[PDB]
Point group: D2
Chain length 118, copies 4
């Protein structure tokens, strides 16, 4: 349950995460399989923090989409089953860019993602 | 709309964001006014990314609570009003640590926060 | 804290709730101040249930928009302050209609609303 | 994609929904497989509205838990695949009862559920 490594989710997206430092911080790269405009998809950086001591840590990360003005955050927990298989159970918020504060109500989508190791 | 500086929210929490780098990455600290167990609250680190080009950027950040096994992620947009006042409109997910995957359904809280500058 | 009566929220929307029955069921109407296409807004029906015994009951309701294929659900709690003023604190999910299951990930928005009496 | 009938979800919960009327309104009964205190689980009524014309309608419903002061709302869309199999793709908010308005921030959980016909 070090987030380091390569993962895929139920939508077919993949992400790679680099070494987790002593503070639990990590960087990585996210390839979404889906977007509002999938023709525009490019690789997008992520940055987050996990807990370090827990065997099944909670964590969060931000994805700065490099092809959109939007941002997504993911949070979840890494679980290990009887056979040692890891799953990241996550929920996310996807924030759209709107023109002014009077449109704020329409700007936040929610969903889930389950990730397993590639 | 650089997130650098000190901010307070509607619950009375305060966060301090350091320099935003050329990628839009930032670190800082978060002092929550509230918690499951407020007697345990300690200053906690945050790490996130904002968009750089946009005058009213979207952003995300993760708070690793230093007194809990939980994690929060925030995402939102920084708006500049006609008088130049900045407001962060955010939504958040708070992930609790549970014992095993059968409890995953109970583990994610959602809410909002509006921040203005200190 | 009977939801019967007229209420307004922070976005300026108004809803009117009819008699709450002995099960806590209620119907009413909802006039949203905002929409994807505000030129199309029409008064829309709502249907929900509140708890009956509690002085500060939790509740939920569904709004079937009469001008959209979307649906919103609201859930929250009615609080009575020390002066007897009632506030509904709510969160909502707004479900859009998409063409097929491959688009399901894009279809759910989240937000808040605070209501007070008219 | 009439919600009428018997359904189960990914957590093992079941629900039965009665006839949907001409306004799209329906009642039913929900048996959750999980709860904060599963020893207390009893059958709980639901009340909601679906859209009528759409082949793959959106909908919402409220579950008034009969063993808790909490309430859940579900919203989603009913999809039909090439072989005629129905799936309800839903997101939910679970509202807890808290003592006063200053605890409101902790009171709303979010998640998903996928339902198929029994
Ligand atoms: O499309 C985008 C950017 C890419 C988002 C991919 C999401 S992240 C949650 C989910 N999990 C995945 O692995 N991938 C999806 N942004 C966007 C979408 C819609 C709108 N809009 O205005 O409707 C604006 C920006
Ligand atoms: O209490 C905690 C850790 C601190 C969370 C503070 C939240 S972050 C969203 C909101 N905005 C703020 O400025 N402050 C609040 N975690 C926690 C809470 C509940 C449970 N639980 O099991 O119920 C477990 C851990
Ligand atoms: O616009 C709509 C229908 C009206 C929704 C009003 C929302 S209910 C939550 C909030 N509280 C209020 O009082 N009013 C707002 N639906 C819609 C919106 C966006 C999209 N979309 O595709 O982006 C599709 C349908
Ligand atoms: O436990 C409860 C009542 C039952 C909730 C069942 C949920 S509905 C979303 C999900 N889908 C299912 O089919 N079943 C689950 N309420 C509750 C839970 C936690 C707390 N709390 O304070 O932590 C208070 C009330």
């Amino acid at each position: 349950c070090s987030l380091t490594g390569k993962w895929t989710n139920n939508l077919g997206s993949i992400m790679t995460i680099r070494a987790v430092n002593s503070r639990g911080e990590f960087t990585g790269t996210y390839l979404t399989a889906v977007a509002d405009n999938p023709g525009n998809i490019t690789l997008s950086p992520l940055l987050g923090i996990q807990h370090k001591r827990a065997s099944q840590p909670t964590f969060g990360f931000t994805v700065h989409w490099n092809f959109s003005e939007s941002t997504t955050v993911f949070t979840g927990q890494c679980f290990i089953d009887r056979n040692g298989k890891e799953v990241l159970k996550t929920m996310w918020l996807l924030r759209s860019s709107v023109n002014d504060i009077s449109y704020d109500w329409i700007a936040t989508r929610v969903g889930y993602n389950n990730f397993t190791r590639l």
